[PDB]
Design an enzyme around this catalytic site. Structure first.
Site: not given
Ligand code: FBV
Ligand code: ZN
Ligand code: BGC
Ligand code: BGC
Ligand code: GLC
Ligand code: FBV
Length: 257
Positions: A116, A93, A195-196
């Protein structure tokens, strides 16, 4: 569908994903003074020597570097975790300028970007089953600040011109994610969410304290990607971060005294 703009961004997500207002949403601000050392944490083990990268994909939100998760190769265990968590993908991000871009914040400080590394708990057999569990996922989060170049990031940077638009992918074999880590594995941990959208509350977050440094030129190339598909009006892929969410009934634990 959902995105990051004023009309489909984080403040709108709750209408199609009501868990957006839930009890353990991510990211959060990490108040370093309130975080407490936790002696029950076991040593953290990041074991990526046999990782098998496959492909890089522009999914219209970010880019994912995907791995073979069909056996145990690159895994994460220890720390707050019970058992074995297989690496499936990493992504970032980032911001439109260096002063923002991270999802987690540290005493309200925003970093230029955040990496991430996404892992799923192998006791559940597949990622879809893991995201039906409270302890299905572990995400290792790493902050990026702008300074010296990160040599282990350059292969990623240089392939981005071949995946400029949504839906494009490219071969990305023989990439070593160990080159994206900082020296120290000191971390903070707490229970949270994706987070999405779909914002599922399945994640044990492990956020490293030491940022990595990347060069201005490296992050500028992230910002040349596009949210849109080929042929469509250009929308630069920038500011693909969710702001900090309420901590509610949680505590952030530290691995270090
Ligand atoms: N950005 S995150 O929380 O690593 C994430 C990982 C996998 C799918 C959706 C997501 F939001
Ligand atoms: Zn992420
Ligand atoms: O090619 C990237 C990495 O792939 C892994 O499967 C190998 O075991 C590592 O030695 C190598 O650095
Ligand atoms: O009741 C005392 C306990 O309170 C909890 O909120 C803390 O996480 C523990 O570290 C502490 O020992
Ligand atoms: O390691 C990831 C990628 O790095 C570079 O793009 C190499 O040219 C390519 O062969 C490799 O797949
Ligand atoms: N809730 S959402 O998925 O962001 C969304 C989707 C489509 C239009 C408007 C929106 F707000």
């Amino acid at each position: 569908h959902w995105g990051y703009g004023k009309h489909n961004g984080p403040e709108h997500w709750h209408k199609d994903f009501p868990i957006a207002k839930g009890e353990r949403q991510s990211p959060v601000d990490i108040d370093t003074h309130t975080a407490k050392y936790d002696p029950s944490l076991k040593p953290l083990s990041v074991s990526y020597d046999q990782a098998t990268s496959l492909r890089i994909l522009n999914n219209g939100h970010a880019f994912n570097v995907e791995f073979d998760d069909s056996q145990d190769k690159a895994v994460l265990k220890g720390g707050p975790l019970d058992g074995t968590y297989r690496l499936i993908q990493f992504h970032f991000h980032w911001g439109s300028l260096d002063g923002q871009g991270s999802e987690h914040t540290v005493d309200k400080k925003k970093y230029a970007a955040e990496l991430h590394l996404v892992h799923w708990n192998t006791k559940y057999g597949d990622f879809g089953k893991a995201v039906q569990q409270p302890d299905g996922l572990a995400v290792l989060g790493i902050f990026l600040k702008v300074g010296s170049a990160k040599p282990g990031l350059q292969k990623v940077v240089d392939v981005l011109d071949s995946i400029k638009t949504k839906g494009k992918s490219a071969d990305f074999t023989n990439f070593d994610p160990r080159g994206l880590l900082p020296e120290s594995l000191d971390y903070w941990t707490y229970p949270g969410s994706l987070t999405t959208p779909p914002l599922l509350e399945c994640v044990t977050w492990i956020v490293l304290k030491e940022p990595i440094s990347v060069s201005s030129e490296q992050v500028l190339k992230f910002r040349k990607l596009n949210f849109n598909g080929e042929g469509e009006p250009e929308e630069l892929m920038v500011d693909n971060w969710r702001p900090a969410q309420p901590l509610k009934n949680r505590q952030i634990k530290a691995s270090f005294k």
